[PDB]
């Protein structure tokens, strides 16, 4: 694809570089999804085939668990829908495959249907994906085996499975190159595989941002890219300090980042901000809170699957109180709990609580992320839609206009999401 090229990136394997300049907001390229799945919770909200968010969604009369825009989207999805239609109804409540198993089954399907290079593989092919097979611990290798067992159990009707456990190779490849599709509010819509998009290496200070216009991945410049510069995306959440960022990257992607931010650690001091207070906190007292903060984060990750919403908020308020003694309110570990608490109030349809948390987050949040960040665009959007809901038309408009500003860069001026937000301002 024009104005870019695949190249050998010293110490980063294969990569994508520019052959022409790209300005802030310019679309480098699009990539139609090679394989994709609409997440189970978004059924009836989005079209299974084109991911269009609409209300007049017609049901699959054969499974009553697949929705479409019309009969053509339904017919166009049947080669992929075939995999789950009858099994969902025949397996009944016993039908529980994870999204990774759902996705991998559609990759195997695509490889049988269309074995030749797809328009999504102009620079990187699915077969050429990096696996990191050789660095997997037994715990990880066992987690892939669960997924393989699950593949065989639910998708054996139409699929012929490959040469021993070269399914381990494929499952390690989808873990390494697999994409999750999120909406305007960064809510999970599904999983997909974008091969050319997967060629891009990581930077904690990227020059590009991946957005989705249905099942189509779009790459837009968030910094100026000049000929010969490598195009880098972020694989992870850029709020956390160097250690946390690299702890996630090493775990999920088996590499350590050495970008300007991870080298310099410049933004680290501000990220884990400490209170100025009479008799400043001791060097060890700081390290003790970081360990607590990082453990309460994981404890919360578990607690959501098995605790009441009023219990979840209690975890948030209690942990914020312990942390507040050492940590300032701008600290990323404090801002996470506030983000968690806002999420709960939103679930409980507590629009005041959600707004009080948003307002408390946004200013310090904006500061901690790059200039064009999907996290802060989404946060400004949540805040705007909350204000607008609570009939605060002035503040709601400021917030929605702030979101539109970041969004016109990453998503593009003509994005369906921008047109939706503009209508929210125009009516109320
Ligand atoms: C989605 S693939 C990117 C394309 C990959 N470089 C290739 O040749 O197939 C992700 C993998 O690329 C490598 N990678 C990406 N960004 C990197 C970086 N900044 N430093 C080192 N390795 C990186 C890691 O091995 C990582 O798991
Ligand atoms: Zn459709
Ligand atoms: Zn069906
Ligand atoms: Zn980095």
Q: What is the CATH number of the domain that holds 367?
A: 1.25.40.10
**Token output for 346:** 């939103």
The bound ligand whose nearest atom lies closest to the alpha carbon of 74 is: 2
Domain check: are 156 and 63 in the same one?
A: yes
Nearest-atom index, ligand 1, CA of 252: 27
The rounded distance, in Å, linking the Cα atoms of 350 and 339 is: 14
Question: Which of 120, 109, 240, 104 minimizes the C-alpha distance to 176?
Answer: 104
Q: Is 336 annotated as a binding residue?
A: no
Q: What residues are in contact with ligand 1 under a 6 Å CB criterion?
A: 12-15, 130, 176-177, 198-199, 201-202, 253-255, 257
C-alpha of residue 134 to centroid of ligand 1, in Å: 15
CB atoms within 10 A of CB 167: 19
Tokens 């005041």, residue located: 352
Q: Could you say which ligand is closest to the alpha carbon of residue 53?
A: 2
Q: Please name the residue that has the structure tokens 């999504």.
A: 120
324 and 406 co-located in one domain = yes
Structure-block tokens of residue 159: 């699929």
Residue 253 assigned ligand-binding role: yes
Question: Do 197 and 95 share a structural domain?
Answer: no
Mutate to test the pocket of ligand 1, among 8, 172, 253 (most ligand atoms within 8 A of CB): 253
Which mutation among 125, 177, 201 tests ligand 1's pocket best, with the greatest number of atoms within 8 A of CB? 201
Question: Distance from the CA of 250 to the center of ligand 1, in angstroms?
Answer: 11
Question: Measuring CA to CA, which residue among 186, 97, 113 is closest to residue 148?
Answer: 97
Q: How far is CA 297 from CA 261, 289, 316, 400, in A?
A: 23, 12, 10, 29
- Other Cβ atoms less than 10 A from the Cβ of 362: the count is 17
As for the chain, the residues directly before each break of C–N over 2.5 Å are none
Q: Is 217 exposed, middle or buried (0-12, 13-18, 19+ CB in 10 A)?
A: buried
Q: Are strands 201-202 and 232-233 parallel, antiparallel or unpaired?
A: parallel
Tokens of 298: 């994981």
Total of domains in the chain: 3
Residue closest by Cα to atom 19 of ligand 1 = 202
| Long-range contacts, stretch 319-322, CB < 8 angstroms, 24+ apart | 319/292, 319/293, 322/292
- Which ligand is located closest to the Cα atom of residue 82? 3
b/e map 393-424, b = 16+ CB within 10 Å: eebbbebbebbbebbbbbbbeebebbeebeee
130 CA closest ligand 1 atom index: 9
202 labelled ligand-binding: yes
Biggest CA-to-CA distance, the chain: 70
Q: At what angle do helices 332-347 and 309-324 cross, to 10 degrees?
A: 160
State the Cα–Cα distance between residues 101 and 357, nearest whole angstrom. Answer: 36
Considering every ligand atom shown, identify the ligand nearest to the alpha carbon of residue 123 and give its number: 1
Instruction: Output the 3-class SS for the chain.
Output: CCCEEEEECCCCCEEEEECCCECCCCEEEEEECCEEEECHHHECCECCCCCCECCCCEECCCCCCCEECCHHHHHHHHHHHCCCHHHHHHHHHHCCCCHHHHHHHHHHHHHHHCCCCCCCCCCCCHHHCCCCHHHCCHHHHHHHHHHHHHHHHHCCCCCCCCCCCCHHHHHHHHHHHCEEEECCCCCEEEEEECCCHHHCEECCCCCEEEEEECCEEEEEECCCECCCCECEECCCCCCCCHHHHHHHHHHHHCCCCCCHHHHHCCCHHHHCCECCCCCCCCHHHHHHHHHHHHHHHHHHHHHCCCCCHHHHHHHHHHHHHHHHCCECCCCHHHHHHHHHHHHHHHHCCCHHHHHHHHHHHHHHHHHHCCCCCHHHHHHHHHHHHHHHHCCCHHHHHHHHHHHHHHHHHHHHCCCHHHHHHHHHHHHC
Residues 117, 250: one domain? no
At CA 58, angle to CA 54 and CA 64, rounded to 5? 120
Q: Are residues 140 and 269 both part of a single domain?
A: no
- Cβ atoms of 6 and 201 closer than 8 Å: no
What is the CA angle 46-49-50, rounded to 5? 70
Which of 201, 217, 235 terminates a domain? The answer is 235
If phi > 0 it is left, if psi is from -120 to 50 it is alpha, else beta; for residue 13 that is left
Identify which of 369, 375, 377, 366 has the alpha carbon closest to the alpha carbon of residue 412: 377
Q: Which of 7, 130, 236, 246 to mutate to test the pocket of ligand 1 (most atoms within 8 A of CB)?
A: 130
Supply 1's token pair: 């694809």
Is the Cβ–Cβ distance between 370 and 222 less than 8 Å? yes
Nearest CA to ligand 1 atom 9: 130
Q: Give yes or no: residues 51 and 23 share one domain.
A: no
Residue to probe by mutation, ligand 1, list 235, 255, 259, most atoms within 8 Å of CB? 255
**CA gap 226, 232 in Å, rounded:** 13
Q: Report which protein residue has its CA nearest ligand 1's atom 20.
A: 12
255 is in an annotated binding site: yes
CB 36 within 8 A of CB 120: no
167 touches 148 (CB < 8 A): yes
Quick one: 312 and 355 in the same domain? yes
Look at strands 216-221 and 232-233 and give their pairing. Answer: unpaired
Residue nearest to atom 13 of ligand 1 (CA): 12
CA distance 122 to 177: 16
Comparing C-alpha atoms, which of 106, 156, 143, 142 is closest to residue 126?
106
Same-domain status, 209 and 96: no
Give the number of other CB atoms < 10 A from CB of residue 247: 15
* Backbone phi, psi, residue 280, to 5°: -55, 155
Q: Please, are residues 342 and 361 in contact by the beta-carbon 8 Å criterion?
A: yes
Q: Are residue 265 and residue 320 in the same domain, yes or no? A: yes
What ligand 1 atom has the least distance to the C-alpha of 202?
16
Domain holding 136, by residue range, is: 42-177
9 and 90 both lie in a single domain:
no
Which of these three, 148, 177, 206, is where a domain ends? 177
Tell me the CA–centroid distance for residue 119 and ligand 2, in Å: 20
Nearest to 204 by CA among 232, 175, 243, 176: 232
Whether 408 contacts 420, CB under 8 Å: no
Query: Does residue 9 sit in the same domain as residue 80?
Result: no
- Distance (Å, whole) CA 5 – CA 419: 33
Distance 93 CA to ligand 3 centre (A): 15
Q: Supply the residue whose CA is at minimum distance from atom 23 of ligand 1.
A: 12
Q: Which residues of 94-107 are buried (b: 16+ CB within 10 A; e: fewer)?
A: eeebebbbbbbbbb
Instruction: Verify that 279 and 362 share a domain, yes or no.
Output: yes
User: CATH code at 230?
Assistant: 2.170.270.10
């Amino acid at each position: 694809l024009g104005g870019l090229e695949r190249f050998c990136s010293p110490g980063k394997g294969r990569g994508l570089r520019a052959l022409q300049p790209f300005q802030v907001g310019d679309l480098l390229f699009s990539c139609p999804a090679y394989a994709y799945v609409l997440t189970v919770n978004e059924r009836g909200n989005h079209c299974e085939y084109c991911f269009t968010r609409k209300e007049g969604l017609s049901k699959c009369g054969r499974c009553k668990q697949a929705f479409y825009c019309n009969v053509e989207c339904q017919k166009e999805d049947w080669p992929m829908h075939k995999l789950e239609c009858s099994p969902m109804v025949v397996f009944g409540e016993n039908w529980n495959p994870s999204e990774t198993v759902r996705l991998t089954a559609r990759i195997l399907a695509k490889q049988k249907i269309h074995p030749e290079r797809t328009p999504s593989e102009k620079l990187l092919a699915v077969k050429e994906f990096e696996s990191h097979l050789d660095k997997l611990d037994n715990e990880k290798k066992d987690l892939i085996q669960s997924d393989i067992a699950a593949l065989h159990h639910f998708y054996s009707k139409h699929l012929e499975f490959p040469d021993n456990d070269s399914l381990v190779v494929l499952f390690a490849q989808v873990n390494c190159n697999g994409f999750t599709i999120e909406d305007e509010e960064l809510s999970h819509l599904g999983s997909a595989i974008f091969p050319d998009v997967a060629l891009m290496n990581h930077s904690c200070c990227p020059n590009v941002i991946v957005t989705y216009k249905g099942t189509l991945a779009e790459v837009r410049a968030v910094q100026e890219i000049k000929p010969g510069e490598e195009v880098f995306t972020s694989y992870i959440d850029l709020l956390y300090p160097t250690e946390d960022r690299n702890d996630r990257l090493r775990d999920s992607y088996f590499f350590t980042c050495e970008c300007q931010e991870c080298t310099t650690k410049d933004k680290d001091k501000a990220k884990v901000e400490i209170r100025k207070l009479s008799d400043p906190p001791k060097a060890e007292a700081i390290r003790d809170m970081v360990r607590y903060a990082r453990n309460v984060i994981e404890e919360f990750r578990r607690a959501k699957h098995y605790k009441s919403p009023s219990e979840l908020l209690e975890i948030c308020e209690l942990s914020q109180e312990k942390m507040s003694s050492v940590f300032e309110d701008s600290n990323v570990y404090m801002l996470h709990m506030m983000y968690q608490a806002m999420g709960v109030c939103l679930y409980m349809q507590d629009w005041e609580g959600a707004l009080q948390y948003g307002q408390k987050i946004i200013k310090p949040y904006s500061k901690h992320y790059p200039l064009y960040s999907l996290n802060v665009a989404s946060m400004w959007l949540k805040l705007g839609r909350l204000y607008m809901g609570l009939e605060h038309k002035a503040a709601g408009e400021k917030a929605l206009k702030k979101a539109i500003a970041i969004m016109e860069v990453a998503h593009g001026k003509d994005h369906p999401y921008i047109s939706e937000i503009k209508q929210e301002i125009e009516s109320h």
